[PDB]
């Protein structure tokens, strides 16, 4: 069992909060995240730990543990850095074609993985995407997100292994341009309407002229409208880790 007895976190500051949950820094052997939820929500704090618990893998947040008393809290490791989103859309920061594919690789591996272990993430976005270290990507939910929805998705179960696949293809569309989709659009309410009604789908022209062929190819079938003709990870991160091999 992974239940840390009350007294053995210090909790210290705290690092943001929300609707659902708060988060801080703590020391429990070391660096570590903690995230309190309040009594009322203990069904979701025990869906949390139920996934959590179910995965290990060098591209997941890694769980670490959770307690009862005082509180509900979930105990993930500590990630230094900032999320893929902040560092595409918020800093200067130019990545290399090479450091984009190997982010698109790393983050391909962590959703095959969460997929072979029957686990749908449901909000994958570059918000999600942790660059611990600068290096590594640690795929989680740190929120606590329209760009990234499938069309049917949008529509309003809607979501399948697909339609991470297709916000997999919105990440690959924001690491390929830099940018975030639908830019252009000023109004939230249009971007819902017209996806979901198949009007509206992203400007693959937008893309970095150094862009692998191989990549606006594989970008354009994960955001096929029709969920069925979207491949799935096994395949996509087989593309990619060829595409890769570019060295
Ligand atoms: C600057 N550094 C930090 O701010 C920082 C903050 C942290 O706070 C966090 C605390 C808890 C979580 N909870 C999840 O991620 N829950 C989760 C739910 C579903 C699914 Cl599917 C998954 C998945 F995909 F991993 F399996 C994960 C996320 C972030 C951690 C590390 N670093």
Redesign the pocket.
Known sequence: DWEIPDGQITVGQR??SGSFGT?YKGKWHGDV?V?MLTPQQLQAFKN?VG??RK?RHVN??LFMGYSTKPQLA?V???????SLYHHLHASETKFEMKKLIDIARQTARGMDY?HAKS?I?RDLKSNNI?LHEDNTVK????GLSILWMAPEVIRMNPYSFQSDVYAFGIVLYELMTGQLPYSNINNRDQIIEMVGRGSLSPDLSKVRSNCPKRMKRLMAECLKKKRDERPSFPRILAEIEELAREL
């Open positions: 690092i943001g988060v995240a995230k949390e996934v959590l995965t997941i947040l979930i993930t490791q500590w990630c230094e850095g900032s969460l686990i993430h942790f795929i989680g939910d740190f």
